[PDB]
Amino acid sequence: GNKICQFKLVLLGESPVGKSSLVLRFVKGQFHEFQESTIGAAFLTQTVCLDDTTVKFEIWDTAGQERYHSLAPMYYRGAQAAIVVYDITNEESFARAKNWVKELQRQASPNIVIALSGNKADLANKRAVDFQEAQSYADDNSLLFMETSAKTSMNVNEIFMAIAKKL
Ligand SMILES: Nc1nc2c(ncn2[C@@H]2O[C@H](COP(=O)(O)OP(=O)(O)O)[C@@H](O)[C@H]2O)c(=O)[nH]1
Numbered sequence: 001g002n003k004i005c006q007f008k009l010v011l012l013g014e015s016p017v018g019k020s021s022l023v024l025r026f027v028k029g030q031f032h033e034f035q036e037s038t039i040g041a042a043f044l045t046q047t048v049c050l051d052d053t054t055v056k057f058e059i060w061d062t063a064g065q066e067r068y069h070s071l072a073p074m075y076y077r078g079a080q081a082a083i084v085v086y087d088i089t090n091e092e093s094f095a096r097a098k099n100w101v102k103e104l105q106r107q108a109s110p111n112i113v114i115a116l117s118g119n120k121a122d123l124a125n126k127r128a129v130d131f132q133e134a135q136s137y138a139d140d141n142s143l144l145f146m147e148t149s150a151k152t153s154m155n156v157n158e159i160f161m162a163i164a165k166k167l
């Protein structure tokens with residue numbers, strides 16, 4: 001197809017749960033066991049083929065520490081989509097994700113598409129957040145949910161593409 005679309009996406013979530021790793025996997029097809037902590041935010045772009053449209057993603061990868069919370073609106077304000085990420089082995093990160101969802105539903109664009117990534121799914125032997133519980137939470141809050149693994153690539157391209165399809 002000859003159509004071209006572009007949209008802004010922001011990743012939010014407790015540090016560290018794998019936000020930068022998810023972006024690196026999608027954008028560069030790489031994964032770093034030793035990933036440097038993000039300071040403020042980092043920016044990357046990726047262009048993909050979605051049916052008859054060339055979709056370009058402008059991605060803001062935010063630093064998740066609480067000291068950066070006040071900067072968050074600078075990144076989500078004009079976003080068309082967000083991926084709120086938690087680590088499936090860390091229940092506290094899942095609770096933190098729910099608070100990011102609340103903040104987006106109250107302060108971001110009313111039409112923003114919100115995805116929820118249960119990351120580090122490859123560490124299911126250390127699971128702390130039940131898949132069905134997270135799915136029910138996502139369904140009740142109209143969030144696009146998938147468990148992902150930046151380490152193995154499981155559902156990484158899929159979650160980004162599912163978002164693009166719903167814009
Ligand atoms: N096993 C596993 N480790 C991961 C995964 N995603 C990220 N990590 C590791 O978790 C650490 C933190 O990842 P990072 O992307 O920096 O987290 P951020 O602070 O949310 O950006 C790094 O050591 C990564 O290699 C994943 O899906 N599986």
Ligand SMILES: [Mg+2]
Pocket residue numbers: 019020021036037038061062063
């Ligand atoms: Mg990071």
